[PDB]
Amino acid sequence: TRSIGLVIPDLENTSYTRIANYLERQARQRGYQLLIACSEDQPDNEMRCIEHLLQRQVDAIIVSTSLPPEHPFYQRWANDPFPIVALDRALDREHFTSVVGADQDDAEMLAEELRKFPAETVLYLGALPELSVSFLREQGFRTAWKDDPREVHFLYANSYEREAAAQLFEKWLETHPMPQALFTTSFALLQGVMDVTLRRDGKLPSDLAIATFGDNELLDFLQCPVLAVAQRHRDVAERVLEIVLASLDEPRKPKPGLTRIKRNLYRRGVLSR
Amino acid sequence: RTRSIGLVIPDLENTSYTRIANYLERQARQRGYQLLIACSEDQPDNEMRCIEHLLQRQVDAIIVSTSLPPEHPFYQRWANDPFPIVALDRALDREHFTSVVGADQDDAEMLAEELRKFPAETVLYLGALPELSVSFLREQGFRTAWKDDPREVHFLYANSYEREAAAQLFEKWLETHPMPQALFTTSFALLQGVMDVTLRRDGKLPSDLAIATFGDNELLDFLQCPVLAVAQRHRDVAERVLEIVLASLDEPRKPKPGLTRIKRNLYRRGVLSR
């Protein structure tokens, strides 16, 4: 049918949507169509989303899976010429080619740059440390702060939400002082922090080195140094499809496993002037 | 029947269209239809090729935000055909096509009326391309409110709905004009441009500047000045677009052709959020 599937959580998170843009422009570039099927990050929906695509004779499916990488569903096409390429969330490494992010290196690069700033109190706010993205990003931080003499207080929330971040930061400040360097592993985490700072200070900070995953351009309006990393949204889209159309239009299928694209760093706030 | 519906939009980078698309996918998935998406890149020539491809996929219907003028001859091929094509955002031939569209006049007036309740002497209306249908209706609504208001309103108009344009024009305007106590912008982009110069000048984003804009962004909550923003009822829109798509198909006769307008929601941000 000359059509490719893309099962993502939703067309609302900016990361997935901007990739899906450069994937439309490059799908129609080669004559193929893109059929978006959202799971709302529900494994029940994703399983059915996939099933409805097979019924539409899609030639290939790119997927950011909500289920475990190794789980009975996807091991149905473990040994199948039917290609399933993973994005952002890896699948079984021995059976599927996944294009993922370089969270560890990315965290390290961001952390190295934050370390140069002359803070005393340095706070690391993350969430769900038991998870992969959470831990990979912690290692990256520690790598760059390994032999640094300053003590970094780590603080972990129950989810990557701003509501949670508000509470946990609001509590933290009772028994700790306002930090001078901040490393947040999500943009949503940083929002929570700012909410409380706005109520406490009456104004968003001007003497604080912020470092965060995820990037909005409105961070240029801050009057403090801001460091932020974002995906190479086009570059990500190139490789996911170049693996799809390798599996279709060549005898040798691509070798399974992971492949990583680094994030870009952006200087926002006062560092943009 | 294939149980598929085409969707031709400018791009998937504009936040309006993407959020409309998100809900359209869900609404369609719930009803038992797949959604095929094709971006025109807002090029008229590309749009035509998209419609052709989508018809070879043999969809039951096509939604389109068209880059052609209403009445344009290309879309007279299906002027009077049972096959349904439902226009989104930008209207098609009102005679023989149903268009889900915003009430830019109604929204503008309502937003303007809210901006009148702040005690601001100088009131700057910044717009762009006044002669465009959209630009016009919004200015029309603004005057319907400030009809008998004794204060003077300065109407500044830019060459493009873009940030950089608004920045240059505003900073050349301040040269001879005092700093406004009230602002009305017809797009977030124009607002952005204003906020650059305010920052380059004052040193900080302001606190005593009543602001009313088209476009929305939750991050407007962080401002310490009053803010008023209008945005489409994306979900409500998405619902009503597909209702027509299906009524058109699942119901004898297509609904009354022409326009149905949907008012934006107003949100309160800055210090209005606390």
Ligand SMILES: COc1cc(O)c(C(=O)c2ccccc2)cc1S(=O)(=O)O
């Ligand atoms: C995010 O809010 C919006 C902001 C807008 O500026 C528009 C426009 O239609 C528009 C009109 C003239 C020039 C440029 C854009 C729509 C929405 S909305 O659909 O998302 O409510």
